[PDB]
C-alpha cells in the first residue's frame, strides 16, 4: 500500500516474512500500452503498442512495437473500444494512457494513467503526431476537431522501442526483468518489417548479440514447450546449441539434440565456465520462482559480465531470433521521410 | 573361507555388516583361460581363450574366443610358459586349467584347476583335439608322445563361446554379471573373423540384437572415455542414441549429441518408460559400486523383461558392435569341414 509475484501459499508467507494489494497474476499474457487524447467530445487514439516482453515485465522495461506485431485487429478494436469508454467515464481532458493485458483472446485492464505517459514521445515520433502539443491545445480549449486531428494514424513502417538498463553500473545486482522498472533510457528502431525495426532497436540499445556462434538455452517449465521452436530458428541461423538438463530433455523429445551442459553445482565444466571462456554468443534463460531465480542468478551476472547478449523472456528470445533475418545497417531513413510516407 | 568387490574402506565395512580372504581386484584386465595336458614329460597347450568380459566377470559367464582376439603373442607366450612351469611343479597328470589376468602388459595368475574344466569340450570342438580322450590316456599311462599329440593346435578359424543365463526364470533377480557364476549353458559361434564367430555365438545365445534402431547408453565413470567410440561405432551402423545425464555430458564433449533420457528419479519420460515402450533395440549399461548397482537395477530388469538386447560391459558392447558388421546366416560349415581345415 516494492512488488513481487508469489506462486503459492508457501511463497505467499515466505514473502510475508521479509515483507497490501493482491491481484491475480495473468500469466503468459501479452501486455499492451495505449496512448490517447480525449476532449470530452471524442477520443483520438495516439498509439497501440504491443510489448515484446509479457505482462509481469514492467512496461517501462519492455520492448515494444508500434503497430502491434502479433495482436488481432479484432482484439485491438476491443482495446480501442475500452479506452474510449474509460476516457469519457473518467472525464479525461488531454492525454491518457491505458495498459492492458491480453490473455486467451481476452482483454484485461491493468491500469489507467490519465496524464502524459513516458510512451508519448516514441508514439509522436513513430506517428508524426506531436501528441503532447495537441493534448496541450486540447487542455487549453482547442478540440481535436478544431485542431484537425481526429483520425488514428497507422504508420507504413514498424517502430520498435527498446530499453537500456543500468545493471552494469551495479554489478551486485541480478540483471533480471520484473514488475518493477529499472531502465534509464530507450532507443527506437524503424523498419519495413518488425524484424527489421527490432534489429535496429536491438542494435541501438548497445546489444552484443551476434549472427553466429553457440547459444545457451535454459528455460523454465512453462516455456519448455515453445523453446523448441526458438531452438529451431537458432539452428537454422547456424547456431550450435547447448542445453541444461531439463531443457535438453525437452528439445531432444522434439528431435533436437543440443550439447548438454552442467549447472554449476553439477560439474566441471559448467555454464559459468563456458560463459567465462566466451563459449557463447547468446543465452536464453527464463526462470520462474523466487528460488529458481536465486539459483540462476550466476547465469545472468556472468553473461552481463562477459558481454554475452542474453534474454530473460521467451518473447524476447523470439524477437532476437526474428531479427537475425534482418540487417540493421542495410537501410536508413530519416524522420522526415518517415513522416512523408504517412497518408 | 558368495564373492564381492569392495572399492573402499567404507565399502569394506559396509560389506562387513552384511557378511575371509582378501585379494586386490585387478581392474580393467583381460581374463584368459588356458586348458593344458601334462604327462609328466611334456605339457600340451590345448587352448588359450580370451574372455570378452574382463576379470571380475566369472569365466563361466564370460563369452570367449579361441584364438585370442586382442592379446599379443608375446604375452600369450608368457602365459604358455607359466602353464608349463605350473604343470610340472604341481605334478599334473592329465588335464589342467589355468586362469590368468592381464593388466598393463603383465600376467597375473588367478587360479589353477588341476582337472578337467568346463571349457574342455569347447576347446576340443574348436581344435579338433579330444582332450578328454587324450588326458584320459595319459592318466591311464599312455604318454603324449606315444599318442602323437604334442603340438598345440591353432585353428584357422575363430571359435567363439557365448553363454545363456537363467535370469528370465527369476525376474526378481538383477540380471547383472559379476564374480559368481550364474549361467546354465553355452553355445559356440564359428567364423572367418572374430566378428563373424561372435555374431554367430550371439545369435545362438538367443540374443534379440537388431542391426538397426535406437541405442541407450548409460555407463559408469571409468567407461566414460571409451564410450565415445562405442557411440560412434553405433552411429556409423545407423543407430540413434539416447543417453542419461553423465554419459550425455561426455558424449557432448566428444561431439556426440545423443538424445537425452531421464533417469527414473529425474522425471519423465525416463528409461523404464522408453524401454517399456519399445524405443530401444540395444542397451549398453555399465555400473561400478554396490550402491550404484542397486540403483540402476531398473534398467537391467526392464531390458530383460522387454526383450531388448543388453550388454553390461564395455568389452561386451564392443563385441556386439563388431558383430554388426557380420551376417551369422551367410555361411555355415560342418565340424568335419572345420576340422578338415586344420593342418
Ligand atoms: N495483474 C497483473 N498481471 C500481470 N502483470 C501485471 C499485473 N499487474 C501489474 N502487472 C505488471 O506489472 C507492471 C506494473 O503494474 P502497474 O499497475 O502498471 O504499475 P506502475 O504504477 O508502476 O506502472 C505492468 O507494466 C505489468 O507488466
Ligand atoms: N583378484 C582378482 N582380480 C580380478 N578378477 C578376479 C580376481 N580374483 C578373481 N577374479 C574374478 O572372479 C572369478 C572367480 O574367481 P576364481 O578363483 O576363478 O573363482 P572360482 O573358484 O569360482 O572359479 C574369475 O573368473 C574372475 O572374473
Ligand atoms: N527490454 C528488456 C531488455 C531485454 C534483456 N535482454 C533481457 O532479456 O533480460
Ligand atoms: N557374456 C555374458 C552375457 C552378456 C550379457 N549380454 C551382458 O552383457 O550382461
Ligand atoms: Cl508513464
Ligand atoms: Cl571348470
Ligand atoms: Cl523371481
Ligand atoms: K510487459
Ligand atoms: K500508476
Ligand atoms: K571374464
Ligand atoms: K576354482
Ligand atoms: Mn503501469
Ligand atoms: Mn575360476
JSON list of N, CA, C and O in Angstrom, two decimals, chain B residues 265-296:
[
{"chain": "B", "resi": 265, "resn": "UNK", "atom": "N", "xyz": [14.18, -41.27, -11.33]},
{"chain": "B", "resi": 265, "resn": "UNK", "atom": "CA", "xyz": [14.03, -40.23, -10.34]},
{"chain": "B", "resi": 265, "resn": "UNK", "atom": "C", "xyz": [14.02, -38.84, -10.99]},
{"chain": "B", "resi": 265, "resn": "UNK", "atom": "O", "xyz": [13.32, -37.92, -10.58]},
{"chain": "B", "resi": 266, "resn": "UNK", "atom": "N", "xyz": [14.84, -38.68, -12.02]},
{"chain": "B", "resi": 266, "resn": "UNK", "atom": "CA", "xyz": [14.92, -37.43, -12.74]},
{"chain": "B", "resi": 266, "resn": "UNK", "atom": "C", "xyz": [13.54, -36.95, -13.23]},
{"chain": "B", "resi": 266, "resn": "UNK", "atom": "O", "xyz": [13.24, -35.77, -13.12]},
{"chain": "B", "resi": 267, "resn": "UNK", "atom": "N", "xyz": [12.70, -37.85, -13.74]},
{"chain": "B", "resi": 267, "resn": "UNK", "atom": "CA", "xyz": [11.40, -37.42, -14.21]},
{"chain": "B", "resi": 267, "resn": "UNK", "atom": "C", "xyz": [10.83, -38.22, -15.36]},
{"chain": "B", "resi": 267, "resn": "UNK", "atom": "O", "xyz": [11.00, -39.43, -15.43]},
{"chain": "B", "resi": 268, "resn": "UNK", "atom": "N", "xyz": [10.15, -37.53, -16.26]},
{"chain": "B", "resi": 268, "resn": "UNK", "atom": "CA", "xyz": [9.52, -38.18, -17.40]},
{"chain": "B", "resi": 268, "resn": "UNK", "atom": "C", "xyz": [9.55, -37.48, -18.77]},
{"chain": "B", "resi": 268, "resn": "UNK", "atom": "O", "xyz": [9.38, -36.26, -18.87]},
{"chain": "B", "resi": 269, "resn": "UNK", "atom": "N", "xyz": [9.72, -38.28, -19.84]},
{"chain": "B", "resi": 269, "resn": "UNK", "atom": "CA", "xyz": [9.93, -39.68, -19.67]},
{"chain": "B", "resi": 269, "resn": "UNK", "atom": "C", "xyz": [11.35, -40.07, -19.45]},
{"chain": "B", "resi": 269, "resn": "UNK", "atom": "O", "xyz": [12.30, -39.41, -19.93]},
{"chain": "B", "resi": 270, "resn": "UNK", "atom": "N", "xyz": [11.39, -41.16, -18.68]},
{"chain": "B", "resi": 270, "resn": "UNK", "atom": "CA", "xyz": [12.57, -41.84, -18.24]},
{"chain": "B", "resi": 270, "resn": "UNK", "atom": "C", "xyz": [12.68, -43.19, -18.94]},
{"chain": "B", "resi": 270, "resn": "UNK", "atom": "O", "xyz": [11.75, -43.70, -19.57]},
{"chain": "B", "resi": 271, "resn": "UNK", "atom": "N", "xyz": [13.87, -43.75, -18.78]},
{"chain": "B", "resi": 271, "resn": "UNK", "atom": "CA", "xyz": [14.29, -45.03, -19.29]},
{"chain": "B", "resi": 271, "resn": "UNK", "atom": "C", "xyz": [13.22, -46.15, -19.26]},
{"chain": "B", "resi": 271, "resn": "UNK", "atom": "O", "xyz": [12.91, -46.79, -20.27]},
{"chain": "B", "resi": 272, "resn": "UNK", "atom": "N", "xyz": [12.70, -46.44, -18.07]},
{"chain": "B", "resi": 272, "resn": "UNK", "atom": "CA", "xyz": [11.72, -47.51, -17.93]},
{"chain": "B", "resi": 272, "resn": "UNK", "atom": "C", "xyz": [10.60, -47.35, -18.93]},
{"chain": "B", "resi": 272, "resn": "UNK", "atom": "O", "xyz": [10.11, -48.29, -19.63]},
{"chain": "B", "resi": 273, "resn": "UNK", "atom": "N", "xyz": [10.19, -46.10, -18.97]},
{"chain": "B", "resi": 273, "resn": "UNK", "atom": "CA", "xyz": [9.12, -45.74, -19.87]},
{"chain": "B", "resi": 273, "resn": "UNK", "atom": "C", "xyz": [9.51, -46.10, -21.29]},
{"chain": "B", "resi": 273, "resn": "UNK", "atom": "O", "xyz": [8.85, -46.89, -21.96]},
{"chain": "B", "resi": 274, "resn": "UNK", "atom": "N", "xyz": [10.63, -45.51, -21.72]},
{"chain": "B", "resi": 274, "resn": "UNK", "atom": "CA", "xyz": [11.15, -45.73, -23.06]},
{"chain": "B", "resi": 274, "resn": "UNK", "atom": "C", "xyz": [11.39, -47.24, -23.35]},
{"chain": "B", "resi": 274, "resn": "UNK", "atom": "O", "xyz": [10.95, -47.79, -24.39]},
{"chain": "B", "resi": 275, "resn": "UNK", "atom": "N", "xyz": [12.07, -47.94, -22.43]},
{"chain": "B", "resi": 275, "resn": "UNK", "atom": "CA", "xyz": [12.34, -49.36, -22.59]},
{"chain": "B", "resi": 275, "resn": "UNK", "atom": "C", "xyz": [11.00, -50.04, -22.68]},
{"chain": "B", "resi": 275, "resn": "UNK", "atom": "O", "xyz": [10.68, -50.92, -23.51]},
{"chain": "B", "resi": 276, "resn": "UNK", "atom": "N", "xyz": [10.15, -49.62, -21.77]},
{"chain": "B", "resi": 276, "resn": "UNK", "atom": "CA", "xyz": [8.88, -50.25, -21.85]},
{"chain": "B", "resi": 276, "resn": "UNK", "atom": "C", "xyz": [8.17, -50.02, -23.19]},
{"chain": "B", "resi": 276, "resn": "UNK", "atom": "O", "xyz": [7.48, -50.89, -23.70]},
{"chain": "B", "resi": 277, "resn": "UNK", "atom": "N", "xyz": [8.32, -48.83, -23.76]},
{"chain": "B", "resi": 277, "resn": "UNK", "atom": "CA", "xyz": [7.63, -48.55, -25.00]},
{"chain": "B", "resi": 277, "resn": "UNK", "atom": "C", "xyz": [8.21, -49.05, -26.29]},
{"chain": "B", "resi": 277, "resn": "UNK", "atom": "O", "xyz": [7.63, -48.77, -27.32]},
{"chain": "B", "resi": 278, "resn": "UNK", "atom": "N", "xyz": [9.34, -49.76, -26.26]},
{"chain": "B", "resi": 278, "resn": "UNK", "atom": "CA", "xyz": [9.91, -50.27, -27.49]},
{"chain": "B", "resi": 278, "resn": "UNK", "atom": "C", "xyz": [10.82, -49.27, -28.18]},
{"chain": "B", "resi": 278, "resn": "UNK", "atom": "O", "xyz": [11.22, -49.40, -29.35]},
{"chain": "B", "resi": 279, "resn": "UNK", "atom": "N", "xyz": [11.18, -48.27, -27.46]},
{"chain": "B", "resi": 279, "resn": "UNK", "atom": "CA", "xyz": [12.06, -47.30, -28.07]},
{"chain": "B", "resi": 279, "resn": "UNK", "atom": "C", "xyz": [13.45, -47.80, -28.36]},
{"chain": "B", "resi": 279, "resn": "UNK", "atom": "O", "xyz": [14.15, -47.18, -29.18]},
{"chain": "B", "resi": 280, "resn": "UNK", "atom": "N", "xyz": [13.87, -48.86, -27.64]},
{"chain": "B", "resi": 280, "resn": "UNK", "atom": "CA", "xyz": [15.21, -49.32, -27.85]},
{"chain": "B", "resi": 280, "resn": "UNK", "atom": "C", "xyz": [15.35, -50.68, -28.42]},
{"chain": "B", "resi": 280, "resn": "UNK", "atom": "O", "xyz": [14.54, -51.55, -28.17]},
{"chain": "B", "resi": 281, "resn": "UNK", "atom": "N", "xyz": [16.42, -50.81, -29.19]},
{"chain": "B", "resi": 281, "resn": "UNK", "atom": "CA", "xyz": [16.81, -52.07, -29.78]},
{"chain": "B", "resi": 281, "resn": "UNK", "atom": "C", "xyz": [18.17, -52.47, -29.19]},
{"chain": "B", "resi": 281, "resn": "UNK", "atom": "O", "xyz": [18.69, -53.53, -29.51]},
{"chain": "B", "resi": 282, "resn": "UNK", "atom": "N", "xyz": [18.79, -51.63, -28.35]},
{"chain": "B", "resi": 282, "resn": "UNK", "atom": "CA", "xyz": [20.05, -52.07, -27.78]},
{"chain": "B", "resi": 282, "resn": "UNK", "atom": "C", "xyz": [20.30, -51.28, -26.57]},
{"chain": "B", "resi": 282, "resn": "UNK", "atom": "O", "xyz": [19.92, -50.12, -26.55]},
{"chain": "B", "resi": 283, "resn": "UNK", "atom": "N", "xyz": [20.91, -51.88, -25.58]},
{"chain": "B", "resi": 283, "resn": "UNK", "atom": "CA", "xyz": [21.13, -51.07, -24.43]},
{"chain": "B", "resi": 283, "resn": "UNK", "atom": "C", "xyz": [22.49, -51.35, -23.89]},
{"chain": "B", "resi": 283, "resn": "UNK", "atom": "O", "xyz": [22.87, -52.47, -23.75]},
{"chain": "B", "resi": 284, "resn": "UNK", "atom": "N", "xyz": [23.24, -50.32, -23.60]},
{"chain": "B", "resi": 284, "resn": "UNK", "atom": "CA", "xyz": [24.52, -50.62, -23.05]},
{"chain": "B", "resi": 284, "resn": "UNK", "atom": "C", "xyz": [24.50, -49.92, -21.72]},
{"chain": "B", "resi": 284, "resn": "UNK", "atom": "O", "xyz": [24.28, -48.74, -21.67]},
{"chain": "B", "resi": 285, "resn": "UNK", "atom": "N", "xyz": [24.67, -50.69, -20.65]},
{"chain": "B", "resi": 285, "resn": "UNK", "atom": "CA", "xyz": [24.64, -50.17, -19.31]},
{"chain": "B", "resi": 285, "resn": "UNK", "atom": "C", "xyz": [25.69, -50.81, -18.42]},
{"chain": "B", "resi": 285, "resn": "UNK", "atom": "O", "xyz": [25.69, -52.02, -18.18]},
{"chain": "B", "resi": 286, "resn": "UNK", "atom": "N", "xyz": [26.60, -49.97, -17.95]},
{"chain": "B", "resi": 286, "resn": "UNK", "atom": "CA", "xyz": [27.68, -50.42, -17.10]},
{"chain": "B", "resi": 286, "resn": "UNK", "atom": "C", "xyz": [27.56, -49.67, -15.78]},
{"chain": "B", "resi": 286, "resn": "UNK", "atom": "O", "xyz": [27.11, -48.51, -15.75]},
{"chain": "B", "resi": 287, "resn": "UNK", "atom": "N", "xyz": [27.95, -50.36, -14.71]},
{"chain": "B", "resi": 287, "resn": "UNK", "atom": "CA", "xyz": [27.88, -49.88, -13.33]},
{"chain": "B", "resi": 287, "resn": "UNK", "atom": "C", "xyz": [28.93, -50.50, -12.42]},
{"chain": "B", "resi": 287, "resn": "UNK", "atom": "O", "xyz": [29.13, -51.71, -12.41]},
{"chain": "B", "resi": 288, "resn": "UNK", "atom": "N", "xyz": [29.55, -49.64, -11.62]},
{"chain": "B", "resi": 288, "resn": "UNK", "atom": "CA", "xyz": [30.56, -49.98, -10.64]},
{"chain": "B", "resi": 288, "resn": "UNK", "atom": "C", "xyz": [30.09, -49.53, -9.26]},
{"chain": "B", "resi": 288, "resn": "UNK", "atom": "O", "xyz": [29.72, -48.36, -9.08]},
{"chain": "B", "resi": 289, "resn": "UNK", "atom": "N", "xyz": [30.10, -50.41, -8.26]},
{"chain": "B", "resi": 289, "resn": "UNK", "atom": "CA", "xyz": [29.70, -49.99, -6.93]},
{"chain": "B", "resi": 289, "resn": "UNK", "atom": "C", "xyz": [28.33, -50.45, -6.46]},
{"chain": "B", "resi": 289, "resn": "UNK", "atom": "O", "xyz": [27.29, -50.05, -7.00]},
{"chain": "B", "resi": 290, "resn": "UNK", "atom": "N", "xyz": [28.36, -51.28, -5.41]},
{"chain": "B", "resi": 290, "resn": "UNK", "atom": "CA", "xyz": [27.17, -51.87, -4.80]},
{"chain": "B", "resi": 290, "resn": "UNK", "atom": "C", "xyz": [25.96, -50.96, -4.81]},
{"chain": "B", "resi": 290, "resn": "UNK", "atom": "O", "xyz": [24.87, -51.34, -5.23]},
{"chain": "B", "resi": 291, "resn": "UNK", "atom": "N", "xyz": [26.17, -49.75, -4.36]},
{"chain": "B", "resi": 291, "resn": "UNK", "atom": "CA", "xyz": [25.09, -48.80, -4.33]},
{"chain": "B", "resi": 291, "resn": "UNK", "atom": "C", "xyz": [24.72, -48.29, -5.71]},
{"chain": "B", "resi": 291, "resn": "UNK", "atom": "O", "xyz": [23.54, -48.16, -6.02]},
{"chain": "B", "resi": 292, "resn": "UNK", "atom": "N", "xyz": [25.70, -48.02, -6.57]},
{"chain": "B", "resi": 292, "resn": "UNK", "atom": "CA", "xyz": [25.39, -47.56, -7.92]},
{"chain": "B", "resi": 292, "resn": "UNK", "atom": "C", "xyz": [24.60, -48.64, -8.69]},
{"chain": "B", "resi": 292, "resn": "UNK", "atom": "O", "xyz": [23.71, -48.38, -9.52]},
{"chain": "B", "resi": 293, "resn": "UNK", "atom": "N", "xyz": [24.93, -49.89, -8.37]},
{"chain": "B", "resi": 293, "resn": "UNK", "atom": "CA", "xyz": [24.30, -51.06, -8.95]},
{"chain": "B", "resi": 293, "resn": "UNK", "atom": "C", "xyz": [22.84, -51.14, -8.55]},
{"chain": "B", "resi": 293, "resn": "UNK", "atom": "O", "xyz": [21.92, -51.20, -9.37]},
{"chain": "B", "resi": 294, "resn": "UNK", "atom": "N", "xyz": [22.64, -51.20, -7.25]},
{"chain": "B", "resi": 294, "resn": "UNK", "atom": "CA", "xyz": [21.30, -51.29, -6.72]},
{"chain": "B", "resi": 294, "resn": "UNK", "atom": "C", "xyz": [20.39, -50.24, -7.38]},
{"chain": "B", "resi": 294, "resn": "UNK", "atom": "O", "xyz": [19.23, -50.46, -7.71]},
{"chain": "B", "resi": 295, "resn": "UNK", "atom": "N", "xyz": [20.96, -49.08, -7.63]},
{"chain": "B", "resi": 295, "resn": "UNK", "atom": "CA", "xyz": [20.17, -48.03, -8.25]},
{"chain": "B", "resi": 295, "resn": "UNK", "atom": "C", "xyz": [19.71, -48.31, -9.69]},
{"chain": "B", "resi": 295, "resn": "UNK", "atom": "O", "xyz": [18.52, -48.21, -10.03]},
{"chain": "B", "resi": 296, "resn": "UNK", "atom": "N", "xyz": [20.67, -48.69, -10.53]},
{"chain": "B", "resi": 296, "resn": "UNK", "atom": "CA", "xyz": [20.48, -48.99, -11.94]},
{"chain": "B", "resi": 296, "resn": "UNK", "atom": "C", "xyz": [19.73, -50.30, -12.22]},
{"chain": "B", "resi": 296, "resn": "UNK", "atom": "O", "xyz": [19.42, -50.68, -13.36]}
]
